[PDB]
Write a protein that binds this ligand. Sequence first.
Ligand SMILES: *[C@@H]1O[C@H](CO)[C@@H](O[C@@H]2O[C@H](CO)[C@@H](O[C@@H]3O[C@H](CO[C@H]4O[C@H](CO[C@H]5O[C@H](CO)[C@@H](O)[C@H](O)[C@@H]5O)[C@@H](O)[C@H](O[C@H]5O[C@H](CO)[C@@H](O)[C@H](O)[C@@H]5O)[C@@H]4O)[C@@H](O)[C@H](O[C@H]4O[C@H](CO)[C@@H](O)[C@H](O)[C@@H]4O)[C@@H]3O)[C@H](O)[C@H]2NC(C)=O)[C@H](O)[C@H]1NC(C)=O
Ligand SMILES: *[C@@H]1O[C@H](CO)[C@@H](O[C@@H]2O[C@H](CO)[C@@H](O[C@@H]3O[C@H](CO[C@H]4O[C@H](CO)[C@@H](O)[C@H](O)[C@@H]4O)[C@@H](O)[C@H](O[C@H]4O[C@H](CO)[C@@H](O)[C@H](O)[C@@H]4O)[C@@H]3O)[C@H](O)[C@H]2NC(C)=O)[C@H](O)[C@H]1NC(C)=O
Ligand code: HEM
Ligand SMILES: CCCCCCCCCCCC(=O)O
Ligand SMILES: [Mg+2]
Length: 335
Amino acid sequence: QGVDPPPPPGPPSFTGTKLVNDADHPWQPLREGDIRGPCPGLNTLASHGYLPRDGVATPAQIITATQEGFNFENNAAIVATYLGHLLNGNLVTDLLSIGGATPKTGPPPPPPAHAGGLNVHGTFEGDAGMTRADEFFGDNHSFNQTLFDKFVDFSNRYGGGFYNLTVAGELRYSRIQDSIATNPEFQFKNVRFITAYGETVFPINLFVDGRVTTDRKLSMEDAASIFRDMRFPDDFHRSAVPASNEGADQVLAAHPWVPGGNADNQVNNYVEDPDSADFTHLCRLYEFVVGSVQELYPNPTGILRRNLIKNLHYWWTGVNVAFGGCDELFPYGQL
Ligand SMILES: *[C@@H]1O[C@H](CO)[C@@H](O[C@@H]2O[C@H](CO)[C@@H](O[C@@H]3O[C@H](CO[C@H]4O[C@H](CO[C@H]5O[C@H](CO)[C@@H](O)[C@H](O)[C@@H]5O)[C@@H](O)[C@H](O[C@H]5O[C@H](CO)[C@@H](O)[C@H](O)[C@@H]5O)[C@@H]4O)[C@@H](O)[C@H](O[C@H]4O[C@H](CO)[C@@H](O)[C@H](O)[C@@H]4O)[C@@H]3O)[C@H](O)[C@H]2NC(C)=O)[C@H](O)[C@H]1NC(C)=O
Ligand SMILES: *[C@@H]1O[C@H](CO)[C@@H](O[C@@H]2O[C@H](CO)[C@@H](O[C@@H]3O[C@H](CO[C@H]4O[C@H](CO)[C@@H](O)[C@H](O)[C@@H]4O)[C@@H](O)[C@H](O[C@H]4O[C@H](CO)[C@@H](O)[C@H](O)[C@@H]4O)[C@@H]3O)[C@H](O)[C@H]2NC(C)=O)[C@H](O)[C@H]1NC(C)=O
Ligand code: HEM
Ligand SMILES: CCCCCCCCCCCC(=O)O
Ligand SMILES: [Mg+2]
């Protein structure tokens, strides 16, 4: 009949480094029905049992898992999780797939809402990823060895054989160029424009062992373990502090870029979108997403309406802090 969704967890009581690849959280292979998707962080958490091993979880579980497993900062966890949930989760059962569609999220929502999981392309998941191919090429969720080979190449060329912030700057730009040249449906706007810079530093801030204090750099062995195998490095210790997108500004600065996309179903035809969110116009992202939610849920009532209102408020609490203040929207009024 429905769940009453609780407010998000706050930061963990203990925020220092610790062993996260421990005896209680062993890597285990996929079973039938287990879901994995485009996020190596969530994938690894599920394969080590920080999340349900089937890859279906509540927002609350996802937040706590990203904190426990990686020391993902609380507000960043809230912004990412409720974004994912609002667009791609089942608001009634309070369950989100970290990958594709599954009966495990429960009775489907009214169309055009889908609860189809983080795999759904075009509003959250998008193009020019590091180890995943653009949806246009037919698979936006699987690890892609050719792309990981480029990751290794760029690490060799710019990072001494390791992934560091210099490499991030170069790889991000190059991957944008690849999509311009090869993908006629390439989009790099709104949510994707913002998340694409954060994701390039997460390997440095979160996949590098927390006992490394200076010269933070990720080995290709550790990268492959997480990105491909969904496995923590042996004896992996999380970041010694809550962290998220530190250094993403410098990635952009290395190759200034403007939100937009290839126009008119043609390659090498990138047109700027002046209405898109960008890093000095973050609240546009809030407004865009609320708009998208209204398209998914044009006239909700009952538990669905209630759970939408709550989840929108939950998300806003994170957005308000992370974006430095946005006016809360109330598309369905109040409870
Ligand atoms: C990601 O990982 C990558 C890979 O590890 C990493 O890249 C390293 O980046 C650092 C910088 O961040 C590199 O170090 C810098 O190198 C600068 C350039 O070095 C060249 O030029 C030096 C200066 O040249 C002057 O003097 C010569 C005459 O000697 C003259 O011709 C020039 O015109 C100019 O006037 C030169 O000394 C240097 O040569 C020495 O070193 C090389 C080896 O690199 C050696 O072969 C030579 O025999 C000689 O010993 C070289 O040709 C350098 O300028 C810069 O120095 C700054 O810091 C010093 C203090 O240490 C200051 O005194 C100085 O004023 C500068 O401000 C610095 O050392 C490093 O070499 C990279 N490593 C690799 C593997 O490429 C990224 O940093 C990582 N990214 C992140 C964010 O972590
Ligand atoms: C893993 O990920 C990679 C990268 O996303 C995928 O490989 C790409 O596959 C696409 C589709 O097959 C390739 O697209 C085609 O590229 C041509 C240009 O290629 C050259 O130039 C690029 C850089 O500019 C190099 O990376 C590449 O090595 C080549 O030297 C274009 O000419 C093609 O355009 C035609 O098709 C499009 C789409 O219909 C039309 O819009 C055009 O008008 C035109 O008719 C085309 O876009 C792409 O080159 C591949 N890249 C690489 C690096 O291989 C893998 O498929 C993916 N999968 C796995 C499992 O590996
Ligand atoms: C907190 C909730 C999280 C959500 C909802 C989430 C969601 C996503 C999604 C949808 C993508 C694909 C983006 C795209 O294709 O445009 C992605 C990619 C990524 N996520 Fe997560 N993520 C979360 C937490 C984390 C954490 C904690 C980490 C690291 C510890 C992480 C690291 C990454 C990285 C590195 C990528 C990029 C993979 C690539 O480009 O190859 N995420 N995430
Ligand atoms: C100052 C930058 C604020 C960053 C807002 C990012 C919005 C959602 C983040 C999702 C990150 C991820 O892919 O895990
Ligand atoms: Mg993608």
